[PDB]
Design a protein around this nucleic acid. Structure first.
Length: 86
RNA sequence: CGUUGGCCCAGGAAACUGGGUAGUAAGGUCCAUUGCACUCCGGGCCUGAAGCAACGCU
């Protein structure tokens, strides 16, 4: 069940928040329009991020073509989210 | 509050960018976490900032 944004985890716990998004935007800017990419470093939200797309088309593509993309030396694990208040 | 300069932290090869003007932001390190959020927030230790000027606006 596809969704505007996507949920990525297995991300590099050690990388700084602001560098992380930039790093991400770069890797996904090509798929469509990013409404926002959400990045937290708390205990619960860490090693994981939500990037929000313009349209559920980019997503499926991002997801299809980017699974296990070795990113900061670690294969990203990508999912469709479940909500996002756009 | 704001704009222009300073100055401090962070990024950068720079130009330039983000933020800020207290044991806090930040730097280092060790443990614990594979974790679904949208107002934020694990723990230990030794380190650890600048904190000005002119002008303008209710």
């Amino acid at each position: 069940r596809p969704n505007h944004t996507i949920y990525i985890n297995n991300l590099n716990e050690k990388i700084k928040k602001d560098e992380l998004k930039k790093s991400l935007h770069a890797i996904f800017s090509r798929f469509g329009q990013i409404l926002d990419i959400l990045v937290s470093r708390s205990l619960k939200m860490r090693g994981q991020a939500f990037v929000i797309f313009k349209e559920v088309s980019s997503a499926t593509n991002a997801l299809r073509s980017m699974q296990g993309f070795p990113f900061y030396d670690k294969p990203m694990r990508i999912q469709y989210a479940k909500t996002d208040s756009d």
